[PDB]
Amino acid sequence: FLISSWHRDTFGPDVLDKLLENIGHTSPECLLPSQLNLNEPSLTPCGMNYDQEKEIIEVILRQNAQEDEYIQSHNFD
Amino acid sequence: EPRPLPAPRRPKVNSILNLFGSWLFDAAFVHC
Amino acid sequence: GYLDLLPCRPFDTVFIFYMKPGQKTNQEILKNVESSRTVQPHFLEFLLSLGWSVDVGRHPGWTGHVSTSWSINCEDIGASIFNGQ
Amino acid sequence: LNTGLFRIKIQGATGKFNMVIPLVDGMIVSRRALGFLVRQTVINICRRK
Amino acid sequence: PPYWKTAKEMVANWRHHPAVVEQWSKVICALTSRLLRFTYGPSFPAFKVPDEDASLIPPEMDNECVAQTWFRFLHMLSNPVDLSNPAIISSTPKFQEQF
Amino acid sequence: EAGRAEACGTLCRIFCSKKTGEEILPAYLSRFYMLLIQGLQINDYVCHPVLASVILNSPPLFCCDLKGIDVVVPYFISALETILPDRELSKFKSYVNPTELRRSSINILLSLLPLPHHFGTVKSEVVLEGKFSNDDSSSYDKPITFLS
């Protein structure tokens, strides 16, 4: 039943990380030869250039923003 | 063979990627 | 009266629960429902799309509980109105 | 989900005749056909039981 | 650490023998099982491991010392991606002398 | 090919295990999407083991609400058109069990049916970095809507 002032339309408004950092701080020798850092992300893979990754990241962000905007706007439909 | 559900105490995906994914990504793309 | 109370078509019952993150006790799961405006509106929209609303006293058919069913003789609370009373 | 669609998981609905069809495990259904499919699944499960 | 560096440099020249990678895999599986046995706790599912491989490591090692040796043995072998490249493997100083 | 297949066996499986509402560094997502695009190719750069592994290892891939995962949707649609209509899967029968592969394909397809009616006219971005797209409609520089 349509209850007045009750419905949706009416209503309105890591232990592994600790281990890795401990190993890194207590053993600088075992670090990679500038290729990789434990906490920081690794470098780009050999198969992909940096410009391609920079294009893909912005394409993904634009896709997510467009989908969120469409979902929010078309709610009343 | 069925695969068990992931444990609730597993680490975050980004940490696993930092620890292993570099080797995995390189191995995938080198034969790609 | 025994013959009268026997129904002529099969009847079922469905229970509905709401869960919030980090909840493992039955008391909290029951408690989150009775509150109003503390759940997603989509839950209420899904609820109202299952069937109409009928008072338990005036309902001439199955109502989910034997003691108050087949009775042929006729400020926000949330989704706790449908608790069965 | 965050995209508006819904994800369904059903436990303990397997008998002699495998599972029930109207809402299989790991299904995605839009909000339009949510209540109808849930009701149909309840009816089918109760009839099977 | 100098001995670790010498071993890592020397072991990289034996990657063409199939037993090396198998032994490294078994030992690293045993070390990682031992590490996760106490890193999270009994609640975390226990990693299955053969009894002999678990017996390779002695139980005298303390919890703190396991992490360092586990990391060092994980990085003991070179990047496994190197095995994909046939030219890199066939470039050891002995191979160059063989060449 | 065995090592390459196991590579995204591991990778493909890692991303599907993400906790709900968990942030992922966008670089990893970009790399994973590039790997998925590279793997799902049928024209000439087709490798049955890696394709089968990618399909099998990630049933809940689309259901895990990955950010921007919908970009690779046309590639998955093109990939499924060459496996489901097949009768016995002669090419893939020497690498994976045909029944399990069919089950994974059905799980993937069943997770994409609501997308057209849910979105409809919403455009989908295309990433044209070479001969990656499988379609031959001469519309590479055009965001394809779900109605088609």
UniProtKB/Swiss-Prot annotation, chain A:
It comes from the Eukaryota. It comes from Homo sapiens (Human). Component of the heterodimeric RalGAP2 complex with RALGAPB. Heterodimerization is required for activity. Catalytic subunit of the heterodimeric RalGAP2 complex which acts as a GTPase activator for the Ras-like small GTPases RALA and RALB. This is Ral GTPase-activating protein subunit alpha-2. It is found in: Cytoplasm.
Swiss-Prot record, chain E:
Highly expressed in brain, mostly in amygdala. It comes from the Eukaryota. Component of the heterodimeric RalGAP1 complex with RALGAPA1 and of the heterodimeric RalGAP2 complex with RALGAPA2. Heterodimerization is required for activity. Non-catalytic subunit of the heterodimeric RalGAP1 and RalGAP2 complexes which act as GTPase activators for the Ras-like small GTPases RALA and RALB. This is Ral GTPase-activating protein subunit beta. The gene is RALGAPB.
